[PDB]
Amino acid sequence: GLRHTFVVADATLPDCPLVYASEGFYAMTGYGPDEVLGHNCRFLQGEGTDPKEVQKIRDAIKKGEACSVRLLNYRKDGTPFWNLLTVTPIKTPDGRVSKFVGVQVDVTS
Numbered sequence: 282g283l284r285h286t287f288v289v290a291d292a293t294l295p296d297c298p299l300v301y302a303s304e305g306f307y308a309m310t311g312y313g314p315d316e317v318l319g320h321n322c323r324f325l326q327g328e329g330t331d332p333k334e335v336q337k338i339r340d341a342i343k344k345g346e347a348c349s350v351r352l353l354n355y356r357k358d359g360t361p362f363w364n365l366l367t368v369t370p371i372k373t374p375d376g377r378v379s380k381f382v383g384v385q386v387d388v389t390s
């Protein structure tokens with residue numbers, strides 16, 4: 282298929298830290314698990330990231346909704362890339378959101 286990466290955020294912690302990342306996520310961003318696990322994904326953002334799109338994800342996460350946005354993101358070396366990002370909430374049977382899962386696609390083409 283098309284090249285994509287996958288992460289899991291723990292929504293039981295208040296700031297959705299990342300608890301699992303696929304090998305391509307590390308390879309695409311230049312960050313190691315030592316710098317990725319335990320942190321909110323937003324460290325990938327930088328000067329040119331559109332706050333109106335960031336705002337859309339902040340809201341959907343607060344509301345436990347799925348969401349899809351394209352964001353400017355930066356590698357560890359500072360270089361930018363366009364990240365089409367889809368977040369999906371994973372609920373327990375009591376309707377509570379337990380995890381968020383992300384699919385990130387570098388769509389710089």
Ligand SMILES: *[C@@]12=NC3=[C]C([C])=C([C])[C]=C3N([C][C]([O])[C]([O])[C]([O])[C]OP([O])([O])=O)C1=NC(=O)[N]C2=O
Pocket residue numbers: 288289290297321322323324325326335336338339342352354364366368381382383385
């Ligand atoms: C990031 N991927 C990503 C994956 C998941 C599963 C979740 C829940 C969030 C992200 N983010 C965004 C970040 O964690 C946060 O949700 C937003 O920045 C909005 O909240 P704030 O408080 O910061 O306004 C991802 N952000 C990225 O920039 N790149 C991703 O790959």
